[PDB]
């Protein structure tokens, strides 16, 4: 059982949270607003922290100290970046995965050792088939 | 070397005005088209309208290895990014950033961005000094692990009528400067603390509790 | 006694967060309906949406004689008003204000509003320190007419290898604290200023030129 | 094959560059010219500056001779509008739209507009 | 059946005011929180604050198959979407939309959204009428391929029967000094209805 | 003579685009700095950023006696002013204005500002036509006191000569399946879109007879 | 029969002096909280025509256009003068440059700036 | 003669400036933006300072030191207040007159010894008639 911390319980966010919880992992879902947790499915044993991921007092509340994986998965790159940097350099989380929208930004994450999931990078694969 | 001020409405103005007056070169990089035009007209600097977090905009500003980038945005998540972007991708050694959340000061230090003293901390120290004037209130924090506090000598206080030599202060504490009625008094041994006087103190955190217990 | 934070977007939040954590009572008075609702949800304070300069709004906030009004607006002309309004019409003795233009710090003092250290000044001091690290850079200014500067020591400096007693500093200057490699050193007579040691100095303005000429 | 890419943005221009390097005739339409900085050195295609919501712009792209139209601006409604003109006004056989809101995906396909949705793409990776 | 007015600041207000006065039911769906509150207070309708293009918002408004959705947004790309969304996903048969770009009128027709006469067209027709008052200026265009022009000379002192007008043209109504004159044969501001393929000759005559 | 378009966001753009295409000279006077810059770049007109109600701005635009000022603002109280200011202080004879409140159309006419057909009226006429398609719905109103309307029925299978319409009514044009039919006497209506021009003092009877 | 438009700072002062003087007053205002006196009060936007009809300017001896907006006050006045043929129409006009176009439509004007130049004349001497 | 400093060359502002200049007084007109000075008349010998009256560097530029009268006459009360306070307490100008919109604010000006011209207060007079 991994201790997964998912930041941002959104469209893409909560999907990670549900696949994680159903796989018997201990999940912590952090989100800017509570109504986002509606996306968290019925069968979900994890805990949820409401709070701004840019605030430090929120990052402490997640217990990233005991985390195996931190997913920075909000709709903001800089936020996701900040989340990751705290995870990597402030809580020394071994695995930190960030959702990065702007493909140009991907580099500065990996230059800090933050694995990245970029939708645009993922799409270029599928858009290649359409020719 | 130019001072790249990366956005921050009004404070960004007065910094730019300050830097220019200090005969420096200033690049203002702001995302507010309206404020950019106001700056352009008032300040004699280079105003680049655009998002400081965009590599392209920073390229347009021509941020050089030796430039000093000052990030003044209200969003720490952005600041830390704009910082790393300037530091890693542009090789800027000297970065100064505003850090809004006092909690976030640490990670900024850890990353090697130099930070301005946190506003809300100063405000809190100033406000708490006004509410409780007769208790050792912290000024501006020095090096990590050494605070710079200050206390006012109360008439009914034990410290009044005591020699500075005779005062038993802990090893890692220094009664730096006495200020008697808006006049600096260099604390010699035979110096005696009088009523209505203001003693500034530098003490290490691991000795602050005892320093206050003795002085107050 | 409550702490009335009168508007200022993000810095107003972190101050409110700070005050509440210090077990104080907070009234946030902000004119941004959007930000007011965000505060209401996050901060456990009293959020009054409205213009702080309006007597009516201040009446609604119930600003009392003993309350501490903190004015954090980016407009000094507003701040000074909100201050005077709070001070004269409501009898608030304790007022803390942000002052944006360093030039405006004086009139705020003259009026008897206590002010937080000017941000743009600090930023300027920090930036100028980074550009010229081997010159006496001013920290946070103490009482009116006494500055609190700091100098690093160069391997090629005259001060290196000199006794602190043997150093001929002017009458109104104090070598307050030496900081050798992130460790506070209490300056005794037989203390020798070593190359690399960071010496903090408190000096009166009428003696700053000579103190620098000697120590640097 | 004559590709018309609308919106020369982050994701936009990446399509434009892969297309041009593959020896396709490209037309890149964008709201503002500074976006075309994102198109690389080796690029033989033409660029139309203009609002893709204006009809006069859509005529200027020569979608008439297009094999593929990519509606790839940051706006769904704009991308939708671009696609509708491509499909129903210039009868372009292949029209691909970048759709952000996954709920909107349906109404595109119901008009026969192929869609690339980032959220739909992400649910795949977030599964892992 | 209710009239769903989907956003458009001030014109949206006066339409809502009009609809309500015509004893209809009105749902105002506007994205401007400020304007929504102003409406709520003034107009006696249902004000749903939110983006009309969002399926969820439309669900909240309860847009039914028989409702008449009126899209009044300044963005045609949005209008066409809000239209298709209401038409395909909600089954609204009756959709009225503002279309800003006169160029875009066609695609809206092609899609089967019924459109209000284009403002900028009317404005242009009105302005051009003022600049050149003595030339056949087009009023409001009728069915696709039939324009409704008006003119205020050789024609003076001629019988309406004697006037040789083309086959697909009708001198609909004469207006002598703010009075309608029914054009008989022996009749000597004339409004004209003519098909485009005969407009040039009708004006020449 | 130039066409002075005095502010109105998007509709102001497309009008300017139209005027320019009609080889006219256009002065756009708009108070939105952002939109002014957008215009400047797109439209090949003179863009003066500023308040149209300010004499100074109008002086900068150089509004001449012969110019045609088009006021397109959403605020009628402003429009009427911008109009009077242009009319009295600048001597502009030709003024076209948008009038938002249908109620306000009258005072604008009384003042001698010529007005574009009211949008919300047209919208209402169009919407009401869609809700009730089988009832005489008004098109675009002609001269003050003469409306231009359009409409199992009794009228089917009747000669246009045999139809007893009131004196101040004219069955202007029949439109059979998207084709204009010039209404002669021996013209017969069939189960046909007939456009009608009638004076208000005879509208009630014209409709009663046509249905 | 006085009709005062805008029940504001300056507005309501007119309304009170009028009502206390035994005149029949009608106070029109954009929002009700302004009304904070035997006269009647109409809530409504003075730029809307339906509001102007609701005031009964038809039976009015005096219409005071006294909102904070010049264009609004102008519009109010023009309706009073040309649509309800009110003999006396008085407008509060802020921008002194606008005063002219009011009087060129026969609308008496009270301008604060014009009033002030009188008092500011004393201070210099 | 008098050395008058008028802040804000606006509608009401410049009217003061013109009456002053024509009366043979030495005038200084400070304004946020230059295009405001179009309002000042042909016959005007005074000097004009462009600048933000809220900035201190602007207040120094006006030479309030040599001023007999400062008129704080911008459209902003707080600005006019700030201007006045600097005039009174920082440049010790004997006569400072402020244009104050909000009548409730009038008090806090006079409590600092700043004479005030309030339009609402002026209007209540006329609205009495
Ligand atoms: N600053 C933040 N702190 C914590 N969570 C955030 C923050 N900003 C955005 N989020 C969450 O991130 C999610 C990202 O959107 P989604 O595309 O739906 O996964 C949203 O549901 C937000 O609530
Ligand atoms: N109406 C429009 N016409 C042309 N381009 C547009 C329009 N609206 C948005 N865009 C483009 O959409 C692109 C999307 O940005 P990005 O998300 O970085 O791919 C931008 O470069 C805009 O220029
Ligand atoms: N367009 C309007 N229609 C009706 N009343 C208005 C309008 N605009 C402003 N007002 C009112 O007129 C008063 C103007 O301010 P004052 O008389 O100085 O307090 C305020 O109470 C406004 O609410
Ligand atoms: N902070 C300021 N400094 C200098 N001038 C100002 C300032 N704020 C406003 N103004 C001027 O105040 C005048 C107000 O316009 P008016 O209300 O017509 O008298 C304008 O000309 C503004 O430029």
Q: Whose CA is nearest to atom 23 of ligand 2?
A: D31
Binary contact (C143, B179; C-beta < 8 A): yes
Give the CATH number, domain containing residue A56: 3.40.50.720
Question: Which residue on chain G is closest to F56 by alpha carbon?
Answer: G97
CATH code, residues F118-211: 3.30.70.1450
Q: Are H14 and H30 in contact (CB under 8 A)?
A: no
Residue-level length of chain H: 129
CA B115 – CA H68 distance, rounded (Å):
46
Q: Is F4 helix (H, G, I), strand (E, B) or coil?
A: strand
CATH number 3.90.1300.10 is the correct assignment for the domain at C118-216: no
Q: Is H54 in the pocket of ligand 4 (CB under 6 A)?
A: yes
Radius of gyration of the CA atoms of chain G, in A: 14
Cα–Cα distance measured from residue B71 to residue B78, given in angstroms and rounded to the nearest whole number: 9
- Cα–Cα distance between F70 and E29 in angstroms, integer? 30
Is residue G31 lining ligand 3, measured as CB closer than 6 Å? yes
CA of H31 to the centre of ligand 4 (A): 6
Alpha carbons within 13 angstroms on the beta-carbon side of residue H105 total 25
Chain A CB within 8 Å of residue D122 CB: yes
CA neighbours closer than 13 Å in the CB half-sphere of residue B161 = 4
> Beta strand E114-115 with E94-97: parallel, antiparallel or unpaired?
parallel
Q: Answer whether G124 touches H (CB < 8 Å).
A: yes
- List all residues 6 or more positions away from E124 whose beta carbon is below 8 Å from its beta carbon: F15, F18, F19, F22
- Every domain range in chain F assigned CATH 3.40.50.720: 1-117
How far apart, in whole angstroms, are the C-alpha atoms of residue H35 and residue H26? 21
Residue of chain G minimizing CA distance to H39: G97
User: Which residue among C81, C104, C110 places its CB closest to the CB of H56?
Assistant: C104
Architecture of the CATH domain E118-205? 2-Layer Sandwich (3.30)
Write the residue in B9, B18, B102 that is nearest to C14 by C-beta.
B102
- Which residues have CB under 8 Å from D34's CB, separation 6+? none
Angle CA A112–A118–A119, to nearest 5: 170
Cα-to-centroid distance, C210 and ligand 1 (Å): 57
Ligand closest to Cα of G52 equals 3
Which chain F residues contact residue G76 at CB under 8 A?
A: 77
Q: Please tell me the distance from the alpha carbon of residue H82 to that of residue C101, in angstroms, as a whole number.
A: 13
Decide if C163 contacts C129 (C-beta within 8 A). no
Q: How far apart are CA F121 and CA F141, in angstroms?
A: 10
Nearest ligand to the C-alpha of residue H34?
4
Which of A5, A31, A72, A98 has most ligand 1 atoms within 8 Å of its beta carbon, as the pocket-test mutant? A31
> H128 and chain G: CB distance < 8 Å anywhere?
yes
Count of domains for chain H? 1
Q: Which subunits count as partners of chain C given 3+ CB pairs below 8 Å?
A: B, H
DSSP letter for each residue of E86-153: IIIIS---EEEE---SGGGHHHHHHHT-EE---HHHHHHHHHHHHH-TTS-EE-S--STTEEEEEE--
Q: What is the dihedral of CA A108, A111, A115, A116, to 10 degrees?
A: 20
Ligand 3 midpoint to CA G11 (Å)? 8
- B37 CB neighbours in chain F (<8 A) are 33
SS3 C158: coil
Instruction: Please answer whether residues E87 and E67 qualify as being in contact, where contact means their C-beta atoms are separated by less than 8 angstroms.
Output: no
- The whole-angstrom separation of Cα E94 and Cα E67 is 7
Atom nearest to D10 CA in ligand 2: 18
| Resolution, Å (one decimal) | 3.5
d(CA G30, CA B4): 49
Considering only the beta carbons, identify the residue of F55, F78, F106 that sits closest to G83.
F106
In angstroms, rounded to a whole number, what is the distance separating the alpha carbons of residues B104 and B71?
Answer: 15
Gap from B18 CA to chain C (nearest CA, Å): 7
Cβ density class C126-158: b for 16+ within 10 Å, e for less = bbbbbbeeeebbbbbbbbeebbbbbbbbeeebe
Residue G31 to residue E143: CA distance in whole angstroms: 45
- For E104-126, letters b (16+ CB in 10 Å) and e give bbbbbeebebbbbbbbbbbbbbb
- The coordinates were experimentally obtained by X-ray
Nearest CA-CA distance, residue E167 and chain F, Å: 8
- Report phi then psi at C152, rounded to 5: -80, 170
What are the helix (H) ranges across chain C?
Answer: 9-21, 33-42, 55-61, 76-84, 105-111, 119-131, 208-215
Chain H hits for C103, Cβ within 8 Å: 55-57, 60
Contacts of B107 in chain A (CB under 8 A): 56, 85-86, 89-90
Mutate to test the interface with C, among H86, H93, H106 (most CBs of C within 10 A): H86
Mutate to test the interface with E, among D61, D84, D106 (most CBs of E within 10 A): D84
Chains B and E, touching by 3 or more CB pairs within 8 angstroms:
no
Whole-Å CA distances, G88 to F50, F116, G85 = 34, 31, 9
Q: Write out the residue range of the structural domain in which residue A41 sits.
A: 1-131
Look-up of token digits 């009170």: G16
Topology of the domain covering E1-117: Rossmann fold (3.40.50)
Is G47 part of the contact surface with chain F (CB cutoff 8 Å)?
A: yes
Nearest 5°: phi and psi at B133? -80, -20
- Give residue C84 CA to ligand 3 midpoint distance, Å: 29
Q: For residues E101 and E120, give the distance between their C-alpha atoms in angstroms, rounded to a whole number.
A: 8
């Amino acid at each position: 059982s991994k201790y997964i911390v998912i930041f941002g319980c959104g469209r893409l966010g909560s999907l990670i949270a549900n696949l994680a919880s159903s796989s018997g992992h201990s999940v912590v879902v952090v989100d800017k607003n509570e109504y986002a947790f509606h996306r968290l499915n019925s069968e979900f044993s994890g805990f949820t922290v409401v709070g701004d991921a840019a605030e430090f007092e929120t990052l402490k509340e997640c217990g990233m100290e005991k985390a195996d994986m931190v997913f920075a998965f909000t709709n903001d790159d800089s936020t996701n970046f900040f989340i990751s940097m705290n995870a990597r350099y402030m809580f020394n989380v071994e695995n930190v995965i960030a959702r990065v929208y702007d493909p140009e930004k991907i580099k500065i994450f990996e230059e800090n050792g933050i694995k990245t999931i970029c939708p645009a990078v993922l799409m270029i694969e599928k858009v290649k088939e359409f020719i | 070397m130019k001072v790249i001020i990366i956005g921050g409405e009004t404070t960004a103005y007065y910094l730019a005005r300050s830097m220019l007056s200090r005969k420096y070169g200033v690049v203002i990089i702001n995302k507010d088209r309206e404020l950019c035009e106001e700056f352009a007209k008032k300040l004699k600097a280079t105003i680049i309208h655009g998002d400081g977090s965009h590599k392209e905009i920073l390229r347009d500003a021509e941020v050089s290895k030796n430039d000093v980038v000052v990030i003044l945005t209200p969003r720490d998540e952005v600041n830390l990014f704009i910082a790393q972007l300037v530091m890693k991708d542009f090789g800027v050694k000297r970065v100064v950033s505003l850090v809004n959340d006092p909690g976030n000061m640490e990670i900024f230090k850890k990353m090697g961005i130099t930070t301005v003293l946190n506003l809300t901390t100063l405000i809190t120290n100033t406000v708490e000094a006004l509410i409780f004037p007769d208790e050792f209130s912290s000024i501006i924090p020095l090096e990590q692990g050494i605070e710079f506090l200050s206390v006012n000598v109360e008439e009914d206080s034990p410290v009044v009528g005591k020699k500075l030599k005779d005062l038993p202060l802990p090893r890692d504490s220094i009664i730096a400067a006495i200020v008697r009625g808006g006049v600096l008094v260099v604390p010699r041994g035979d110096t005696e603390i009088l009523s209505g006087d203001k003693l500034y103190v530098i003490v290490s955190a691991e000795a602050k509790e005892t320093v206050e217990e003795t002085l107050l």
